[PDB]
């Protein structure tokens, strides 16, 4: 765990158990010109390539690979089900480039075999602004693994970014790597219960029998909060200052511009609900005031472990904000937490409703932010996965990830991880 890292042993990363006293860049300053203007050396038969999301075929290949090779053989029937919609949303954040959506195609077969994505973001690390990139969607074909190509991809994506004068990045990973800045856990709230035990994504306790299952997970068919409308372009100016105001409590965050805020929460118009990705909602008051906002996105799995099904609806809790405790000076005040807690339970309660209504079968959260105030209550069941947050070329003191030493939620201090990854 601590020394089994050939590649990361050479990278600008915080090392295991490092007592960071002064936060900041790791490497000594460099400039884009003292950076190779030519891609790294690939296996003799392989070749590099960019991915134009606007290109039907090019993007078509990407999700095929990710749908076939994203699961790592612990079959329960699942295969991710990335859609063109999903990636059109995820890969076209303001500032994106085809260069940055890198892949590897075999010189002759032209079949894409590897992929890794980078999109520009400004990060807030304990008040310091850090021009960065966000890395995600790293994937290699199953008959090309354990052959150490990933580090090549990581070196090639870094080069291309460095060549644009961007020297840092935030990436998340399950596996433990040199320097997590924080760790959070995945909790899952069932919506189409029966359908889950059916597909094996949920266990069934003998002494709480199937009947009681569905009976407990039950949920209204319509929301319950006054003014619960839905996000519209007109709301932006206002919801952005509310979101900004609320996110200031965290130590790690993405400093959205109104453009990336807009792009992020208002997706493509005219998309069947059978193909929508982002769901942003907002609470307005007679006053005309927006005081709440929350969002979740959709990423389903294809199926094979069930005869009646072939799909599984999954929703993830994204960003949200409220003005409950804006009256209090200290976030952790006993009463300040009073407000904030009930509201989030309300909002998230409706978010679960909108989710099943949108056809999701299970809602996923991550102990990050204050999802800990409502996770257990609204009954989100803690799962196998854990996520680690990393900062490339940046030294920062550990950030509370919403976990207690025994992996139990920490209703106490909650979390300071303000970002949420796709």
């Amino acid at each position: 765990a601590m020394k089994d890292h050939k590649f990361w042993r050479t990278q600008p990363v915080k090392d295991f158990d490092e007592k960071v006293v002064e936060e900041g860049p790791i490497d000594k300053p460099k400039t884009p010109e003292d950076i190779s203007d030519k891609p790294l050396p690939l296996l003799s038969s392989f070749e590099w390539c960019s991915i134009d999301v606007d290109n039907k075929k090019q993007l078509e290949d990407v999700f095929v690979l990710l749908n076939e090779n994203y699961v790592e053989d612990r079959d329960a029937g699942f295969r991710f089900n990335y859609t063109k919609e999903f990636f059109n949303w995820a890969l076209k954040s303001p500032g994106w480039k085809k260069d940055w959506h890198i892949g590897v195609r075999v010189k002759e077969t032209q079949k894409l075999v590897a992929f890794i994505s980078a999109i520009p973001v400004t990060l807030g690390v304990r008040g310091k602004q850090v021009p960065s990139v966000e890395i995600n969607f790293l994937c290699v074909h199953k008959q090309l693994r354990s052959k150490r190509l990933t580090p090549v991809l990581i070196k090639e994506i870094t080069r291309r970014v460095n060549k644009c004068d961007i020297w840092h990045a935030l990436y998340t990973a399950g596996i433990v790597l040199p320097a997590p800045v924080s760790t959070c856990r995945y909790t899952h709230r069932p919506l189409n219960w029966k359908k889950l035990y059916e597909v094996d994504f949920t266990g069934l306790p003998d002494g709480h029998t199937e009947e009681d299952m569905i009976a407990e997970n039950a949920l209204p068919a319509k929301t319950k909060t006054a003014g619960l409308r839905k996000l519209k372009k007109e709301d932006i100016d206002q919801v952005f200052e509310l979101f900004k105001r609320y996110q200031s409590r965290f130590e790690l965050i993405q400093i959205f511009t109104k453009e990336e805020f807009e792009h992020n929460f208002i997706g493509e118009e005219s998309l069947p609900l059978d193909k929508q990705v982002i769901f942003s909602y907002v609470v307005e008051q007679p006053d005309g005031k927006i005081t709440d906002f929350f969002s979740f996105y959709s990423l389903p799995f294809t199926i094979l472990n069930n005869t009646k099904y072939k799909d599984l609806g999954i929703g993830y809790l994204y960003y949200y904000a409220t003005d409950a405790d804006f009256q209090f000076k200290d976030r952790f005040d006993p009463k300040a937490t009073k407000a904030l807690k009930t509201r989030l339970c309300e909002l998230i309660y409706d978010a679960c409703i909108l989710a099943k209504n949108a056809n999701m079968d299970v809602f996923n959260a991550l102990t990050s932010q204050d999802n800990t105030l409502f996770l257990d209550d609204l009954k989100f069941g803690p799962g196998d996965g854990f996520l680690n947050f990393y900062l490339f070329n940046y030294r920062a003191k550990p950030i509370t990830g919403g976990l207690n030493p025994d992996n139990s939620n920490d209703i106490k201090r909650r979390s300071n991880v303000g970002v949420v990854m796709l």
């Binding site: 899952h188 990423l299 799995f301 999954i314 069941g381 996965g385």
Partner: peptide, 8 residues
């Protein structure tokens, strides 16, 4: 990250 996770 990855996602769906599991539990028993």
């Amino acid at each position: 990250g990855l996602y769906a996770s599991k539990l028993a």
